Amino acid sequence: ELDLPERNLDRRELRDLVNELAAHPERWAEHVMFPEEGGRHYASLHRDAYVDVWLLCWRAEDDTGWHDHDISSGAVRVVAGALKECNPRIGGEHLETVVSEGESFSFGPDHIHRLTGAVHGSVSIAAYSPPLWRLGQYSIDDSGVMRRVSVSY
Amino acid sequence: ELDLPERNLDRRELRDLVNELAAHPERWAEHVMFYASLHRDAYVDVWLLCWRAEDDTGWHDHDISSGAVRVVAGALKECNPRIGGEHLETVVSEGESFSFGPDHIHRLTGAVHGSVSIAAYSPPLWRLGQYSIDDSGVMRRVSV
Numbered sequence: 001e002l003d004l005p006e007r008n009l010d011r012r013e014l015r016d017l018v019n020e021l022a023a024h025p026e027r028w029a030e031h032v033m034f035p036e037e038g039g040r041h042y043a044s045l046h047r048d049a050y051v052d053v054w055l056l057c058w059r060a061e062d063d064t065g066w067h068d069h070d071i072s073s074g075a076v077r078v079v080a081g082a083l084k085e086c087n088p089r090i091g092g093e094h095l096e097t098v099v100s101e102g103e104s105f106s107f108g109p110d111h112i113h114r115l116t117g118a119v120h121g122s123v124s125i126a127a128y129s130p131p132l133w134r135l136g137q138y139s140i141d142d143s144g145v146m147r148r149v150s151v152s153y
Numbered sequence: 154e155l156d157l158p159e160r161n162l163d164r165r166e167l168r169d170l171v172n173e174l175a176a177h178p179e180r181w182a183e184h185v186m187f188y189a190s191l192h193r194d195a196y197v198d199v200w201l202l203c204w205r206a207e208d209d210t211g212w213h214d215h216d217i218s219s220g221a222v223r224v225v226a227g228a229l230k231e232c233n234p235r236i237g238g239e240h241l242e243t244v245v246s247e248g249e250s251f252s253f254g255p256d257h258i259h260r261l262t263g264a265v266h267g268s269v270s271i272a273a274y275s276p277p278l279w280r281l282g283q284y285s286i287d288d289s290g291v292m293r294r295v296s297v
């Protein structure tokens with residue numbers, strides 16, 4: 001797969017990584033695929049003890065839900081289209097940012113977010129270090145009470 | 154009238170809008186002249202702009218409006234302010250477009266005489282903050 005360092009990458013290095021990958025379509029163009037039904041297409045470009053890299057192809061309906069990445073830092077580069085990056089606020093008036101093609105962002109391991117509102121056919125590259133082996137998925141009950149499900153991923 | 158969702162538009166939708174309008178010269182060609190409104194309603198303001206080389210917006214924000222710009226002919230310089238005084242400058246050439254969310258601060262300057270561009274804002278541009286420096290060097294924002 002990818003020829004990356006044998007160590008964890010910090011946020012900035014992860015952002016450099018997804019941006020340089022966007023400039024090397026030889027590493028990912030083959031894997032571009034839009035599942036007509038089923039779940040969010042994801043394609044692993046690289047998974048080892050230190051870094052995970054995925055190529056994501058979005059449908060208009062795709063939604064990560066609210067989640068954290070446990071101990072993983074991460075970065076996202078939008079290659080084509082646009083996404084909405086959302087961050088939760090306790091009041092309920094959550095922060096929403098449009099990330100469009102050519103743009104990228106990164107976060108450390110404390111980040112809680114939701115990606116949704118994609119242009120149909122959008123394409124993005126995501127990288128995580130350490131690997132995204134566990135994620136916390138938040139849900140709300142009828143009461144309004146918030147819980148966090150830790151998911152092996 | 155423009156067939157648009159009945160709501161404020163985000164920066165991606167505004168970019169799509171200005172590029173779509175650029176591809177339909179039947180709607181704006183008559184209005185080139187060296188600021189013509191193409192459509193204004195509760196959700197969007199869409200403008201055709203013809204630039205002279207001396208034109209300068211000054212540093213400003215759009216309060217709560219997202220925006221997009223398509224350069225139809227010529228070229229513009231888009232500048233974003235930086236702490237330190239070494240502002241970031243980008244030439245936007247004919248065919249090219251960009252958009253921004255409501256937190257944007259920028260300055261647009263004509264880069265070639267006779268440039269023509271299409272801009273769109275949502276929500277409509279009711280207030281703009283124009284930034285200035287006094288003789289202290291202290292920055293202020295006048296809401297216009």
Ligand SMILES: [Mg+2]
Pocket residue numbers: 154155192193194
């Ligand atoms: Mg209208």
Ligand SMILES: [Mn+2]
Pocket residue numbers: 064067068069113
């Ligand atoms: Mn995530």
Ligand SMILES: [Mn+2]
Pocket residue numbers: 210213214215259
């Ligand atoms: Mn402006």
